[PDB]
């Protein structure tokens, strides 16, 4: 047991943590793979998402090579403070932490040749700028940018370890409002004023589930709009009945629009759902406005002609509006 | 690596972090440049915005001059705790932190001539007093104030390293509700009774996007107010129809006004939007009063004249109200 203890002591005796492996030599190649535990929140209000992942980094450090021990040394995670580790960070993360119960979720595993396996369990909130013009028929693309903070490509190089299999767990992710259509791994270099830097990107494509919004948002608006046409089938002289129906459907449309929380009132810019709700609001507005002409053109001064045409124009125009809308947004 | 290791140990050996560069000599000039990552939030309730940036400080320290190595030493971020660094702070900063995953998002880079480059990735919530009287047609000016804590211009000087190009990344800012109209850099000395203190200011001007409020607030109120005029074209004896229209428009207007109070960010003083909703509420209130007068002057005691007059005055006066409103606010 002391032989292993002596071996570890030798490695850290005189070890310089301020100097990267092969300082001044070829850049140290760091390979990364990720196991995604879950995607928790995908918020349009904050335009971000939360991600819990197992993040592994592999690199070779000759200063940590050991012989005579035919085993890979898994060490207490507190030894990571006594080694050089890449200054990797997530360029687009908003807030992140490494889990710490019961201990810090950190792993250091050595191999005889000097390879270091450095694993962390990280929950990171990452910025995902979402395009909500077509909401709720929208498709998003959320990324995770992995970059070196201080070292340029002359010092450190990144690669996905295992190619396109370097990220696992995506198939298991379940989102209450999206489906993971695809994910991609990219590797590139980004050039700044201070030099070029290695970049690894992981991106997902998210397609929103539309079935729920049809029953919740679109269907009630459609039915109320059809109700407003019941006025065209009531006698022109039933002023109380036709005004009550007309103004109460206008009230109903406002009710739907005001506190339909699926409209995302906390995000103030125009979306596809907004256009549709206002399209239906204009129709019910016109159905009641049509009776002003019908009532006036009889009592104030043909009367059946306006109602006769509205029985066709309103159903026809609303279908034309729906056709144009769905084609444009689908 | 040993040669550089001994070179670095030479620099720190005998180093005194408690003394500024050129202690007792000319003031140390600190150049600053900021690479803006994002403005995550801008909240009117708290009157502040959240900013992510790379904050860089650049100065010269003769005690850190090294010779024989024709390279700029990029060191581990932990070496920053063993050097002197400026005591820069943000005057209007409510809360801020340096990102810490995977390592502390901090950078130290030395140069042979003793020049130190010091970068930090900072998320800060900075106070921004906003004048929301013209909300939602308001334009805000949010600043970041950078100052020295315990040094005067006799010891430390600040400047924007690179002139007006000292700040980059402004085109990266994507606020859903605003658009960055302009930004400025200001360098000045603040003179108190205790002396003169260096000050740097970065300020952005934000113009709020109005399109959302056209669809959500102004357009529904205009259509409901117009709908209340349909009463003027109905018979004076259709009391149930004309009262139901007038009273239901009043209920609809309150619904729009009261529920908008919940969706909007609770600013408790009179704004531009409040004046428009109250204007439209008064108009529909007066239209219902118009029928009460018509009903009374007929049954309680001409009648067609009042409706004829109201058919013109109400649309005309509402147009005048809009003209006065938009000129006084646009």
């Amino acid at each position, epitope marked *: 047991m002391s032989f292993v203890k002596e071996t570890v002591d030798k490695l850290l005796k005189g070890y310089d943590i301020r100097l990267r492996p092969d300082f001044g030599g070829p850049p140290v190649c760091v390979g990364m793979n990720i196991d995604i535990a879950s995607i928790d929140m995908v918020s349009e209000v904050n335009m971000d998402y939360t991600l819990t992942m197992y993040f592994q980094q592999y690199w070779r450090d000759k200063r940590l090579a050991y012989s005579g021990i035919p085993l890979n040394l898994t060490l207490d995670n507190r030894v990571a403070d006594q080694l050089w580790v890449p200054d990797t960070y997530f*360029l*687009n993360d908003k807030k992140s932490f490494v889990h710490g119960v019961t201990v810090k979720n950190r792993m250091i595993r050595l191999h005889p040749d000097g390879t270091v396996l450095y694993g962390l369990r990280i929950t990171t909130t990452a910025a995902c*700028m979402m*395009d909500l013009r077509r909401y709720p028929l929208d498709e998003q*693309n959320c*990324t995770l*940018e992995i970059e070196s903070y201080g070292y340029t490509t002359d010092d450190i190089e990144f690669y996905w370890r295992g190619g396109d299999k370097a990220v696992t767990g995506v198939e298991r992710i379940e989102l209450p409002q999206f489906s993971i259509v695809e994910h991609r791994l990219v590797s590139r*270099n*980004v*050039v*700044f*004023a201070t030099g070029a*830097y290695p970049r690894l*990107s992981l991106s997902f494509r998210l397609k929103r589930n539309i079935g729920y919004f049809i029953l919740q948002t679109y269907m009630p608006s459609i039915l109320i709009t059809i109700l407003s046409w019941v006025s065209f089938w009531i006698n022109y002289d039933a002023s109380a009945a036709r005004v009550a129906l007309g103004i109460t459907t206008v009230l109903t449309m406002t009710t739907i629009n005001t506190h339909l929380r699926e409209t995302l009132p906390k995000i103030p810019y125009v979306k596809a759902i907004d256009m549709y709700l206002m399209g239906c609001f204009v129709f019910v507005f016109l159905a009641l406005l049509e009776y002003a002409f019908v009532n006036y053109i009889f009592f104030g001064r043909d009367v059946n002609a306006i109602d006769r045409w509205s029985r066709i124009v309103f159903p026809f125009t609303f279908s034309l509006f729906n056709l144009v809308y769905w084609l444009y947004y689908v | 690596m040993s040669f550089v290791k001994e070179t670095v140990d030479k620099l720190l050996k005998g180093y005194d972090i408690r003394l500024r560069p050129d202690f007792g000599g000319p003031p140390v000039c600190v150049g600053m440049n900021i690479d803006i990552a994002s403005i995550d939030m801008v909240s009117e309730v708290n009157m502040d915005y959240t900013l992510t940036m790379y904050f860089q400080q650049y100065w010269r320290d003769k005690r850190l001059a090294y010779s024989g190595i024709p390279l700029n030493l990029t060191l581990d971020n932990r070496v920053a705790d063993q050097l002197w660094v400026p005591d820069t702070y943000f005057l209007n900063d409510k809360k801020s932190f340096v990102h810490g995953v995977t390592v502390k998002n901090r950078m130290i880079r030395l140069h042979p001539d003793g020049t130190v480059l010091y970068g930090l990735r900072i998320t800060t919530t900075a106070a921004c007093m906003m004048d929301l009287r013209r909300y939602p047609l308001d334009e805000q000016n949010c600043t970041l104030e950078i100052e020295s804590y315990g040094y005067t211009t006799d010891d430390i000087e600040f400047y924007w390293r690179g002139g007006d190009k000292a700040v*980059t990344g*402004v*085109e*990266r*800012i*994507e*606020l859903p509700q605003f*658009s*960055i*109209v302009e*930004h400025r850099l200001v360098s000045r000395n603040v003179v108190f009774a205790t002396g003169a203190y260096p000050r740097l200011s970065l300020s952005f001007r934000l*113009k709020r996007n109005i399109g959302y409020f056209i669809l959500q607030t102004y357009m529904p109120s205009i259509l409901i107010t117009i709908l209340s005029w349909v009463s003027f074209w109905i018979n004076y004896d259709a009391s149930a129809a004309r009262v139901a229209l007038g009273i239901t428009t009043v209920l609809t207007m309150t619904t729009i006004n009261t529920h908008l109070r919940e969706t909007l960010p609770k600013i408790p003083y009179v704004k531009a939007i409040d004046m428009y909703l109250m204007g439209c509420f008064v108009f529909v209130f007066l239209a219902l009063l118009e029928y009460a007068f018509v009903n009374y002057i007929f049954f309680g005691r001409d009648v067609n004249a009042i409706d004829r007059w109201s058919r013109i005055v109400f649309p005309f006066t509402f147009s005048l109200f809009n003209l006065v409103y938009w000129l006084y606010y646009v």
Partner: nanobody, 124 residues
Framework: QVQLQESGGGLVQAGGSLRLSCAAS????????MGWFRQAPGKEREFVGA????????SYADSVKDRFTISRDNAKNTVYLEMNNLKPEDTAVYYC??????????????????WGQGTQVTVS
């Protein structure tokens, strides 16, 4: 992906003005920053200007500043380069490029993913 095609190039007398349009189709939201470059006959691509997604923010090269302007129209997915007070040195092939949201600085061509076939502008 994104597809870019520039237009509006031609021959203009020195001291005049010209307008170049760049039409973008595809995942234009994934590449919100549009930058303008110019390729001189012998030199390399030189940064000219850039504009954000909202269009309220813009940046220009020092020499080109106060003569050129950049405007955006997300409705038509077009960015315009209004060039005024043209000079003989301005003769070059003006390229339109699109940059991703996290690609570093504006002045480096390597950071732009998609390029157009730059229209030619020559000043007499």
């Amino acid at each position: 992906q994104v597809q870019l095609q520039e237009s509006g190039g031609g021959l203009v007398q020195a001291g005049g003005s010209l307008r170049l349009s760049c039409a973008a189709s595809g995942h234009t939201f994934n590449y919100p920053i549009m930058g303008w470059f110019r390729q001189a006959p012998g030199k390399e691509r030189e940064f000219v200007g850039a504009i954000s997604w909202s269009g309220g923010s813009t940046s220009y090269a020092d020499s080109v500043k106060d003569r050129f302007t950049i405007s955006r129209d997300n409705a038509k997915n077009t960015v315009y380069l209004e060039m005024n007070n043209l000079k003989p040195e301005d003769t070059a092939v003006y390229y339109c490029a699109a940059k991703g949201r996290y690609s570093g600085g504006l002045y480096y061509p390597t950071n732009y993913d998609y390029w157009g076939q730059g229209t030619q502008v020559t000043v007499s």
